[PDB]
């Protein structure tokens, strides 16, 4: 299994994989109980009021001032039972993802995608960037800095605004300069979205009530894909967007969708990014990888005593798949760069995960959500690592009956309809 221990939220802290921690949010916070489910990966069963100090209020604004398509519940994830269920739900989704070859490949890439040690001002020394670490309270009550790649945390005020969040650098654009940074994914396994089986209905903002439910494993995978891009520092700048001209409803409102999202979804959506802008990005990131190889060559010493310079230089040789000549000098091989870049951007896509999970899912990112449902994937009678909602040897096994909220109604509680509110 990807997660070797089946944590219970109330398990006693041990200061190693169950501990109270603080994150580098450049602010003050009380320690929060966290769980290390795998090397470099932690889960914090708390609403995210930490990564962004300006988003510490879970209470919903006045009804007359609510972004109409959203969902608020200040009480969600406030009790121990909820946190226990959250932990078990997130763990289950990681196992479901890991159980597929594609998911195993993606998670392996994520674990190997250690944020680059580029926090040194002296080019002759290699140093870690503190914001790519968390402070773990040890048994003696002292704090120790631990590097990590990924954190899964609960959503902020708007429960359904799932997204990758990461700490920036004063000058370096870590998610776009090849360096990478620790990714905090706001996510919840306790809710999902309804979509429509007919394309003309799903992509219309006035039709459909959300007959089918999105498998949360796909939703998490989508975020993990963004995380992969960001950990390897190849995310596409959000200012690079597609001025949608294939959907009258999007078009009539001049709506734009980032290339990063289209790339992440994959399939036909990825084609909205023309060959010219794509060759542009590829060259840009190729050069960023070149700079990393260069920085490694100039490194003559390392800061800290946790690992050796040789060990860390090798860690990044593996991450970026660099080549080492006779002088021990690192260089970026075009074939290897293209292969890795393509893996992270074209192989790891939402559309491909749908193929591996064998689930029904939106056919394009350019659609309109229909509703949000409350769910509970923890009980095996409701959802499994192997079949999600479409349980084998039951009436829910075929035709995505498990995702059919009308047939499998006992597994979904519609909390809000979005149709007609865009």
């Amino acid at each position: 299994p990807f997660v070797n221990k089946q944590f219970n939220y109330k398990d006693p802290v041990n200061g190693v994989d169950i501990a109270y921690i603080k994150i580098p949010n450049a602010g003050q916070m009380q320690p929060v109980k966290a769980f290390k489910i795998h090397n470099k990966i932690w889960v914090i069963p708390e609403r995210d009021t930490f990564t962004n100090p300006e988003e510490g209020d879970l209470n919903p604004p006045p009804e007359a001032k609510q972004v109409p398509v959203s969902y608020y519940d200040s009480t969600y994830l406030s009790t121990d039972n909820e946190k226990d269920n959250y932990l078990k739900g997130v763990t289950k989704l990681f196992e479901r993802i890991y159980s597929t070859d594609l998911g195993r490949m993606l998670l392996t890439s994520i674990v190997r995608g250690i944020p680059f040690w580029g926090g040194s001002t002296i080019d002759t020394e290699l140093k870690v960037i503190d914001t790519n670490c968390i402070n773990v309270i040890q048994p003696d009550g002292s704090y120790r800095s631990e590097e990590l790649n990924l954190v899964i945390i609960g959503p902020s005020a708007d429960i359904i605004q799932f997204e990758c969040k990461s700490f920036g650098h004063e000058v370096l654009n870590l998610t776009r300069n090849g360096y990478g940074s620790t990714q905090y994914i706001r996510f919840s396994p306790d809710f999902t979205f309804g979509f429509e089986e007919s394309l003309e209905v799903d992509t219309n903002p006035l039709l459909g009530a959300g007959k089918f439910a999105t498998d949360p494993a796909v939703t998490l995978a989508h975020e993990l894909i963004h995380a992969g891009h960001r950990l390897y520092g190849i995310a596409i700048n959000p200012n690079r967007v597609f001025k949608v001209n294939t959907n009258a409803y999007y078009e009539m409102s001049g709506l734009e969708v980032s290339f990063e999202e289209l790339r992440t979804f994959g399939g036909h959506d990825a084609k909205f990014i023309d060959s010219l802008q794509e060759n542009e990005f590829r060259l840009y990131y190729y050069n960023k990888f070149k700079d990393i190889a260069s920085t490694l060559n100039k490194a003559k010493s390392i800061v800290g005593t946790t690992a050796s310079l040789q060990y860390m230089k090798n860690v990044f040789k593996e991450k970026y798949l660099l080549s080492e000549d006779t002088s021990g000098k690192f260089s970026v091989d075009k074939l290897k760069f293209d292969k890795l870049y393509k893996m992270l951007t074209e192989i790891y896509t939402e559309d491909n995960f749908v193929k591996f999970f064998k689930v029904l899912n939106r056919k394009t990112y350019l659609n309109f959500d229909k509703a949000v449902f409350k769910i509970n994937i923890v009980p095996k009678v409701n959802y499994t690592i192997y079949d999600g909602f479409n349980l084998r040897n039951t009436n829910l096994a075929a035709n995505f009956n498990g995702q059919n909220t009308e047939i499998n109604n006992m597994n979904f509680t519609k909390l809000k309809n979005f149709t007609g509110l865009f």
């Binding site: 799932f162 979205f193 969708v257 959500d369």
Partner: peptide
């Protein structure tokens, strides 16, 4: 991000 999920989008619209």
């Amino acid at each position: 991000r999920r989008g619209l």
